[PDB]
Amino acid sequence: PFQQFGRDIADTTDAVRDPQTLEILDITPCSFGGVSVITPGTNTSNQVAVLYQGVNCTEVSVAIHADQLTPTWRVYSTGSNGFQTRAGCLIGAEYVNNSYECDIPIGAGICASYQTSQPIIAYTMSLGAENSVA
Amino acid sequence: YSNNSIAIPTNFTISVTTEILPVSMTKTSVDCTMYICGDSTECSNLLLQYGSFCTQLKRALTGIAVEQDKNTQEVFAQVKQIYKIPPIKHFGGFNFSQILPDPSKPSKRSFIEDLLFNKVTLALICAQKFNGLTVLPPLLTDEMIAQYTSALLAGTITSGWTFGAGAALQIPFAMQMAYRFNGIGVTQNVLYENQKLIANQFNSAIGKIQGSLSSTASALGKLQDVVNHNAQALNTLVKQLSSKFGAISSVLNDILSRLDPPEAEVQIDRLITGRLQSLQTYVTQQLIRAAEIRASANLAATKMSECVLGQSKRVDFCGKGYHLMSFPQSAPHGVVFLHVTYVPAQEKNFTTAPAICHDGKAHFPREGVFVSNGTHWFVTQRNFYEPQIITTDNTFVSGNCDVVIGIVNNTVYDPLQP
Amino acid sequence: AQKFNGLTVLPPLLTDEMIAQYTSALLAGTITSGWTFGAGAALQIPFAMQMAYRFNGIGVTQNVLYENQKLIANQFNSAIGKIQGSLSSTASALGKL
Amino acid sequence: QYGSFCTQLKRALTGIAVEQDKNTQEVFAQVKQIYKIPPIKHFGGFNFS
Amino acid sequence: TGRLQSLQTYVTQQLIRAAEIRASANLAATKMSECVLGQSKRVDFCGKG
């Protein structure tokens, strides 16, 4: 009853008591992270993919995102057209079920490459050809 | 010690030891502006006047993060093809069930790999993350590293050291162990005549490995130290945000909501100086630890190449005793080598001579050593007592008996005479 | 003067006597059992026969050692004697420490 | 008011100090038992005095 | 400020030198294992010749 707000191990305010309703509200910082651009060389193509690192695809939305509102950024800032990898939300790359040698490392076993539609593809990297010794 | 006494082992022991090596550490990324200033534009503009420290820190952290994946790739991705063990597990009586993959569990790790995985406990994460610090997942998942170790094990136990030099050439495991025995100076007939005993000793040592790992708390010490060091560094970096550094408050929003810009600049700059110093200290410590981890990973890669993909003559490089073989196992942020070595066990002392005098000729052993049990003289291999009659095939002649010091008169049998 | 301002020097865990004992043990093991003491129990062997094994290890038959034992011992003793002058003369020999 | 710099420096110095003893132990304590030379110094004519 | 900066510089230099000394000590331990406790086929690892 005498306590007002709570702190974590790092001493950052993570809970607070409402002055009027006298209820305990948990506080979670709004989502953030790094943005990575996955691209073949400009000698090859100008197509890119965007990886929002460590965030669920549902959170990625242009309206509140730090991404700009320029048409291309609007295309690359919609989580609806986004594949969810353990490394984050990937937009602009199509996930295939084949396995190739890693070309552009995304993370958590996911790699990306450029293949002739000629979009960026994302796949699970192949460790090598399976072999059984006689 | 005397000038005519030698000690030769009459038995042996198969000993399996464990060596644990860190390979990679946690890949971390830090947002310079978010950490120093949070979401305040005034602080961001003030920090913009400090030059390009943020880009330097970002580049250093990115280099460390890429180097971690490079370390893992170099240590584990040393196999060209993913070999698979045959469904039939008849390897001369040797039992690798405790180190082979277990398909029942989803992770497909072995029994010992699961023990290692459970033995290392991680160090809470959200609070560290909330201030511009992120943890990048490793490029290779634990499943992929387990697959790499399984491929290495299958190649080793189905093709010996041949798969490390080219195509995997199958060979029965008993004959592979005979080759390994030849590699340490013991004739292969010893292996073929003590196969059951050697298999039993190997199985017993593999069984003891489990208790050896479980009992000693400091066995998995290096990996735990790496994890603890990373967690402690991140905790200190986050705790540094609570310092005032001579300002009136450690919260930037309070400074913004309590002071006008001309007076807020002083406090914001005081905070910026301390936070930038703490960030730079963290980056320098990370660079030093990354260099240490890279050295450890290079050592681990060398051990993978020379102990697992081959048989090493280097003393104590692949365990105590004469190296026979080695088996890799994955572990959190590291690798574990099970070194199987040969140890002489029960030595007896015999009389010895450097040469044998016969018909005015000096005979020297071709591949062994002359021994005497008190009355008769034999020639035996050096690492295992197996006496044999001294003939003209066990020895070679060089000069007369007037030069060698300690030469002993004896008769040398001749196979052609009868 | 360095110590007076909060700086201290912690003595090493192993004294120089203990390190000398370790080196003496290593020397005794090497010269009484060859390389056997590093792989398990120390198996005694006459030093001439140990040197014959060493010669076999470098591609020279042991009869060479047994027929030039006196010359080899003389050369080894001469080199050990020269080590003293080699250390004493050059000032940069003990440079790293 | 400067935070926990002192603890960091103390931990770093302690780690270095322990690592020095570890280095000496690894270099020299590679022998299981303290072997002793025999009183008689007849080693094929070699002189280790 | 100045004294803390000097202390931090000293600690960083000590860490770098400790890493170098650890590398040297690992090399010395390897040489003890492979040159003293055995005979090495590695060229120039245990001397010329």
Ligand SMILES: *[C@@H]1O[C@H](CO)[C@@H](O[C@@H]2O[C@H](CO)[C@@H](O)[C@H](O)[C@H]2NC(C)=O)[C@H](O)[C@H]1NC(C)=O
């Ligand atoms: C070599 O040593 C092994 C032990 O490592 C001996 O095998 C044991 O022999 C005793 C009888 O003396 C049995 O009671 C044990 O059950 C055996 N153990 C195993 C694992 O087989 C072996 O007899 C020894 N050989 C020689 C020639 O001494």
Ligand SMILES: *[C@@H]1O[C@H](CO)[C@@H](O[C@@H]2O[C@H](CO)[C@@H](O)[C@H](O)[C@H]2NC(C)=O)[C@H](O)[C@H]1NC(C)=O
């Ligand atoms: C290889 O060793 C394992 C033990 O590590 C053996 O599995 C055990 O077998 C006994 C007898 O069948 C059972 O009582 C245990 O419960 C088993 N333990 C486990 C973990 O499975 C296995 O049988 C051995 N393989 C061979 C061919 O003998």
Ligand SMILES: *[C@@H]1O[C@H](CO)[C@@H](O[C@@H]2O[C@H](CO)[C@@H](O)[C@H](O)[C@H]2NC(C)=O)[C@H](O)[C@H]1NC(C)=O
């Ligand atoms: C040294 O070894 C020789 C050869 O094995 C032993 O001579 C044998 O002794 C047994 C007695 O148990 C006889 O049955 C054999 O006929 C002997 N062989 C020959 C070729 O004469 C000798 O006894 C051993 N000396 C010891 C153990 O002191």
Ligand SMILES: *[C@@H]1O[C@H](CO)[C@@H](O[C@@H]2O[C@H](CO)[C@@H](O)[C@H](O)[C@H]2NC(C)=O)[C@H](O)[C@H]1NC(C)=O
């Ligand atoms: C081993 O070498 C030492 C020298 O390093 C010999 O000791 C010398 O012996 C000569 C002749 O007796 C003396 O004049 C010297 O004063 C001795 N020097 C020292 C430092 O003791 C020793 O005699 C040699 N051992 C053998 C067995 O010849």
Ligand SMILES: *[C@@H]1O[C@H](CO)[C@@H](O)[C@H](O)[C@H]1NC(C)=O
């Ligand atoms: C404040 O007034 C509102 C209005 O009804 C009431 O619901 C609430 O319980 C009051 N809280 C306190 C702390 O007085």
Ligand SMILES: *[C@@H]1O[C@H](CO)[C@@H](O)[C@H](O)[C@H]1NC(C)=O
């Ligand atoms: C993202 O949010 C959805 C909806 O809550 C959830 O089903 C999904 O598991 C989340 N993503 C991850 C990686 O957990």
Ligand SMILES: *[C@@H]1O[C@H](CO)[C@@H](O)[C@H](O)[C@H]1NC(C)=O
């Ligand atoms: C991959 O396989 C899954 C089934 O696990 C299927 O739902 C999906 O459509 C497949 N995608 C492609 C590109 O083959």
Ligand SMILES: *[C@@H]1O[C@H](CO)[C@@H](O)[C@H](O)[C@H]1NC(C)=O
């Ligand atoms: C082994 O050493 C003992 C101890 O002195 C000795 O009595 C015995 O004769 C030695 N054995 C041989 C074969 O010389």
Ligand SMILES: *[C@@H]1O[C@H](CO)[C@@H](O)[C@H](O)[C@H]1NC(C)=O
């Ligand atoms: C071994 O040493 C003893 C003691 O001096 C000696 O009598 C004997 O001749 C030596 N043996 C040889 C082969 O030199």
Ligand SMILES: *[C@@H]1O[C@H](CO)[C@@H](O)[C@H](O)[C@H]1NC(C)=O
């Ligand atoms: C060895 O044999 C030769 C020739 O028969 C003889 O001259 C010599 O004295 C013998 N040595 C011993 C120690 O019996």
